[PDB]
């Protein structure tokens, strides 16, 4: 089946595209403990109806460009910046780990 995913739009700064951060979890192959781990997918939005903060289902689609093999299925719940903040803070934390 066309693999579906669910995640938060963390970037609306492309023409007809959004970055959907996608969380997922599993039991660690030796130490048991379940562990969260995420990936960002770039998703087609040929109507730019999806805005920063949405949770969304995405679907394995035919290649729209490079880096881009997913279309935005349908909305799951608008206005959820709390998770976007979780992302952005992390991102920002970086500056302090260099030289």
């Amino acid at each position: 089946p066309k693999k579906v995913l669910t995640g938060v739009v963390v970037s609306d700064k492309m023409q007809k595209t959004v970055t959907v951060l996608v969380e997922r979890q599993f039991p660690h192959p030796l130490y048991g403990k379940v562990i969260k781990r995420s990936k960002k997918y770039l998703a087609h939005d040929p109507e730019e109806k999806y805005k920063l903060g949405d949770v969304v289902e995405i679907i394995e689609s035919r290649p729209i460009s490079k880096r881009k093999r997913f279309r935005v299925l349908r909305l799951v719940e608008s206005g959820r910046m709390d998770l976007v903040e979780k992302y952005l803070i992390r991102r920002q934390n970086y500056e302090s780990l260099s030289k």
Partner: protein, 138 residues
């Protein structure tokens, strides 16, 4: 602030028996009763009833121990010699049905929460299910 009230509970008991004692009172819980129900029903205690210590629900759990012994250190044998938690809050330990442990060669119990109620090594093996292996007692 207690993280796993259960491992607590169990510890409350482990410590209780060590010096032997009428009862010990874990704070109440619809899961801790559950767990306890299988201790008594399998004969590791006399039982338990609800109580309170100023608005605060607890569980008076009446222990069980062996027959006084002869020779030096005449303290009884223990009904519960060993009770250590499996699945912990820092590493959930789930098990399919064919994976379920065989405590001490049937002599002990593997209490364990499941999709259809808190069963045990024998109980679940029968009903044919599995779930969060809660702990091993003997």
């Amino acid at each position: 602030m207690l993280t796993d009230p259960i491992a607590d509970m169990l510890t409350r008991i482990r410590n209780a028996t060590r010096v032997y004692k009428e009862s010990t009172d874990v704070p109440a819980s619809r899961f801790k009763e559950e767990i306890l129900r299988i201790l008594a029903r399998e004969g590791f205690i006399k039982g338990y009833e609800r109580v309170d210590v100023d608005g605060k629900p607890y569980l008076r759990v009446y222990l069980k121990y062996g027959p006084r012994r002869q020779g030096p250190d005449p303290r009884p044998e223990q009904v519960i010699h060993h009770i250590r938690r499996i699945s912990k809050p820092g590493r959930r330990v789930y098990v399919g049905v064919k994976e379920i442990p065989r405590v001490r060669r049937g002599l002990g119990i593997a209490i364990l929460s499941t999709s259809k109620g808190v069963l045990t090594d024998r109980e679940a093996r029968k009903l044919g299910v599995g779930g969060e292996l809660i702990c091993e007692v003997w």
